[PDB]
Coordinates of C-alpha atoms in Angstrom, one line a residue:
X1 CA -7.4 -15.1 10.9
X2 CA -7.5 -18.8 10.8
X3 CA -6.7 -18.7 7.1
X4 CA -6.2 -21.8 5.5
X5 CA -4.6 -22.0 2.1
X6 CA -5.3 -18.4 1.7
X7 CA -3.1 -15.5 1.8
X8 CA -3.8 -12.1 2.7
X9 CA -2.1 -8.5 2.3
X10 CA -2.7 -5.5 5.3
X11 CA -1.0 -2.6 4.1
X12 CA -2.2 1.3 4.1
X13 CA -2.6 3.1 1.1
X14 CA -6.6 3.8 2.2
X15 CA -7.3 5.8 5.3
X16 CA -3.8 6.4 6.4
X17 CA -2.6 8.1 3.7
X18 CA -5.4 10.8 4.1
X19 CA -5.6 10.1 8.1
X20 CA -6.2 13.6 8.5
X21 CA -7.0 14.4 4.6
X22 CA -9.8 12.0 3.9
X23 CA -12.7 14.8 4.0
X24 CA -10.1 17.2 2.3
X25 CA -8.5 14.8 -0.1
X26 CA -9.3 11.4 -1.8
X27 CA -11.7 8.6 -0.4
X28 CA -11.4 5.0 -0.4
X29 CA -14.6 2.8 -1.3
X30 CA -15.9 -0.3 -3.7
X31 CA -13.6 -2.7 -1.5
X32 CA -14.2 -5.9 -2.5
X33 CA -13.9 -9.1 -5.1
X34 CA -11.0 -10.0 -3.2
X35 CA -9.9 -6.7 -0.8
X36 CA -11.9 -5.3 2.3
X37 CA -11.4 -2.6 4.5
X38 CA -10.3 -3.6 8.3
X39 CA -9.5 -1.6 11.2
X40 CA -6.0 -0.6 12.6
X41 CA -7.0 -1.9 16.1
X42 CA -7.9 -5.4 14.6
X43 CA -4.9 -5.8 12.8
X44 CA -2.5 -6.3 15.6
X45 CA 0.4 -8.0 13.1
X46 CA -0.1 -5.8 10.5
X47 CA -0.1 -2.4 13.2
X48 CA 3.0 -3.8 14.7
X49 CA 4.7 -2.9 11.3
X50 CA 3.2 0.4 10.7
X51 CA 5.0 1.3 14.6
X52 CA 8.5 -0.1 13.0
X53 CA 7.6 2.2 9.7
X54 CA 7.0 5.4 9.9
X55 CA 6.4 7.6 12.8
X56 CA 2.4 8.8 13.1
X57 CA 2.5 12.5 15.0
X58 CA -1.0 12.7 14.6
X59 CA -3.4 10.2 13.2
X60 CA -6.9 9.8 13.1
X61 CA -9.0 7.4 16.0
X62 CA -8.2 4.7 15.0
X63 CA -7.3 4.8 10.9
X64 CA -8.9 2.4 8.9
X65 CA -6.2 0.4 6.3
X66 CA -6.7 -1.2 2.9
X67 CA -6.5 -5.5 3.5
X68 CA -6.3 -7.3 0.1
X69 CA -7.4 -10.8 0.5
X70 CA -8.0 -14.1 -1.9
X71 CA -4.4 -13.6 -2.8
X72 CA -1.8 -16.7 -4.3
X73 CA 1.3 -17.1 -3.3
X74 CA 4.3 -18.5 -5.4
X75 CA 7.3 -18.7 -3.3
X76 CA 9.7 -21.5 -4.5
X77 CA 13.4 -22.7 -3.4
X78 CA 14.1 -22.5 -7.0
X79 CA 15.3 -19.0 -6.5
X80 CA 15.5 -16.4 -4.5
X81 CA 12.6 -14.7 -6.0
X82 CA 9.0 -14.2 -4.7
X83 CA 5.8 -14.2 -7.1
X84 CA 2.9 -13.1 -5.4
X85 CA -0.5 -11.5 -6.6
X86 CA -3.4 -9.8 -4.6
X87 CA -6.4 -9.9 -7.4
X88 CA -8.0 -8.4 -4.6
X89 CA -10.0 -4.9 -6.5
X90 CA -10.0 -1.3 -4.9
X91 CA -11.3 2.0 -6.0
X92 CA -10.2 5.4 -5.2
X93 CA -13.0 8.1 -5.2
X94 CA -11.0 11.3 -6.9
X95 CA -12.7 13.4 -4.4
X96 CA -16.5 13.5 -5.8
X97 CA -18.1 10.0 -6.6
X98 CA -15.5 7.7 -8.0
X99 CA -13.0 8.7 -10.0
X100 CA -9.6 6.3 -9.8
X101 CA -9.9 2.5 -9.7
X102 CA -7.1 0.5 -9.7
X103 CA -6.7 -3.5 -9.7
X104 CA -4.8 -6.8 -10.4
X105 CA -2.3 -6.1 -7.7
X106 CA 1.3 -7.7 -8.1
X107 CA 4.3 -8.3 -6.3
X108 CA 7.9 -9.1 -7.7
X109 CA 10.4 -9.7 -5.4
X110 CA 14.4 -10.6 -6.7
X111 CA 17.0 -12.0 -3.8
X112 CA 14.6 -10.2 -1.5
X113 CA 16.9 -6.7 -2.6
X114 CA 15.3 -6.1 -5.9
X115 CA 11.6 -6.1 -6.3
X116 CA 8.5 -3.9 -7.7
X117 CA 4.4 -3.9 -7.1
X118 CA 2.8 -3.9 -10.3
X119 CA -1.2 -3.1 -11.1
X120 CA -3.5 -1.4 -13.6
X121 CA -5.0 2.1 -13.0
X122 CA -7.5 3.4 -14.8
X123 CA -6.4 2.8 -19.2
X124 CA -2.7 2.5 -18.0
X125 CA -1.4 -0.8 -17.6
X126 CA 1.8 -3.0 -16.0
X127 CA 2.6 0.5 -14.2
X128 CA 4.9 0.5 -10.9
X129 CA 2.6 0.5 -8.0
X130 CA 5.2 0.7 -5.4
X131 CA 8.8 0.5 -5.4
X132 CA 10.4 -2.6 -3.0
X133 CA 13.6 -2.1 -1.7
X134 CA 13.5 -5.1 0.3
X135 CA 11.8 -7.5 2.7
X136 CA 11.8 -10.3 5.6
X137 CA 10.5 -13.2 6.3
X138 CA 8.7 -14.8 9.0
X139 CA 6.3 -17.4 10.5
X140 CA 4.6 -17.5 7.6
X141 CA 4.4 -14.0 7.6
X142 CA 6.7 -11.7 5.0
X143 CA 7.3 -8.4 5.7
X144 CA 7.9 -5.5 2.9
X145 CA 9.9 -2.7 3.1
X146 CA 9.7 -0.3 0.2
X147 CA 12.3 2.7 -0.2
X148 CA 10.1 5.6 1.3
X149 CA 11.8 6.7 4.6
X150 CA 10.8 10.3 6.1
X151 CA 11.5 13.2 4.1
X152 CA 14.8 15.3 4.0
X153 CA 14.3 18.4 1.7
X154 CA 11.1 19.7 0.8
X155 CA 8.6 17.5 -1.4
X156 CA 8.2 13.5 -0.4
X157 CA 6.5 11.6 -3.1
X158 CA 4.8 8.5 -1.7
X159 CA 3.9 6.7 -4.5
X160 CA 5.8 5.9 -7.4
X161 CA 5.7 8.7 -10.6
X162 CA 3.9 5.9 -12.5
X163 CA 0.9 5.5 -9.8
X164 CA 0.9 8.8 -9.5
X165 CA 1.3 10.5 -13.0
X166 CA -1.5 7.6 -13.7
X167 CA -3.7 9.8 -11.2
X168 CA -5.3 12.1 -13.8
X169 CA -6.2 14.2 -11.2
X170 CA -5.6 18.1 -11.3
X171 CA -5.1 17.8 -7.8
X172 CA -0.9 16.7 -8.3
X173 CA -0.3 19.7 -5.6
X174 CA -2.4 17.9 -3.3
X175 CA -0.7 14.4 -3.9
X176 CA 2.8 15.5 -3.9
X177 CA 3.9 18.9 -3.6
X178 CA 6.7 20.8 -2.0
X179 CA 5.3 19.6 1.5
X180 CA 6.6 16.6 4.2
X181 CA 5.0 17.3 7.8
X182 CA 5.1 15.0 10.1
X183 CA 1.6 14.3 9.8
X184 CA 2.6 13.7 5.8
X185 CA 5.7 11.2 7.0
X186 CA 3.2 9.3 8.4
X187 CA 0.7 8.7 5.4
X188 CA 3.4 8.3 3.4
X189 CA 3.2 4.1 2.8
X190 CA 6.1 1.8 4.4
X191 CA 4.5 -0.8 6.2
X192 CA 3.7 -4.0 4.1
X193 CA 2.4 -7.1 5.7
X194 CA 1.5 -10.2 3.9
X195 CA 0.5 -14.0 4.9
X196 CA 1.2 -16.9 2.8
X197 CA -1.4 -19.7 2.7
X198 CA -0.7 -23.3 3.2

């Protein structure tokens, strides 16, 4: 808190996507150069808009999130398009030591209706991180709302097909498979909460 021309980005993506998978499934580590790990509890915003996302059934004590900080912001009257980029850098452990890294988050935002996350993982590049449907603004605060609401047939992909064909993991079942518990509805990413500096 008491940011000052600073912006910073709380969102999932670590921890809560494997709340009840992270022994049996990927592991989040080398958080830093701009991104840090921080507790759900602590983020009291940010776990306001998990609650109005997803439903969690069942979640771990307490699930730890992904926080991106050292972030710029380049919102302008101009249009009604938002340019903002977390340089914050994250790496994925692919089960055994390391394994996925990704970095140079993005965020493009058009008329607050039309907008895309882009990043780098591993030799891919300018892939589609996350898919933005739209979003809100606030005090200071913006809100993001991607297109990812609770499953209705049989296999919910959470990330995009570029993030996660970009995996290079033999593990796709375990990603996305013909699966959507409750449990899965609530890993699956929704929540986005960013602060603007100034």
């Amino acid at each position: 808190s008491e940011e000052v021309k600073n912006a910073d980005l709380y969102w999932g993506f670590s921890g809560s996507s494997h709340h009840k998978y992270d022994h049996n499934g990927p592991k989040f580590e080398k958080a830093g150069k701009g991104a840090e790990l921080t507790n759900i509890d602590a983020a009291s915003a940010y776990a306001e808009t998990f609650k109005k996302g997803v439903f969690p059934n069942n979640k771990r004590e307490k699930s730890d999130i992904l926080v991106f900080h050292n972030g710029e912001v380049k919102t302008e009257t101009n249009h009604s398009s938002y340019q903002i980029n977390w340089p914050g850098e994250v790496t994925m452990k692919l089960g055994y030591g390391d394994g996925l890294v990704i970095k140079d988050l993005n965020l493009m935002l058009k008329n607050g209706n039309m907008g895309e996350l882009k990043a780098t993982v591993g030799e891919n590049s300018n892939i589609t991180l996350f898919d933005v449907q739209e979003y809100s603004v606030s005090d200071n605060t913006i809100t993001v709302t991607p297109k990812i609401p609770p499953c209705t047939t049989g296999t919910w992909k959470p990330w995009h097909n570029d993030l996660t064909s970009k995996l290079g993991s033999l593990k796709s079942v375990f990603f996305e498979s013909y699966t959507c518990n409750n449990d899965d509805i609530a890993k699956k990413p929704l929540p986005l909460t960013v602060v603007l500096n100034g």
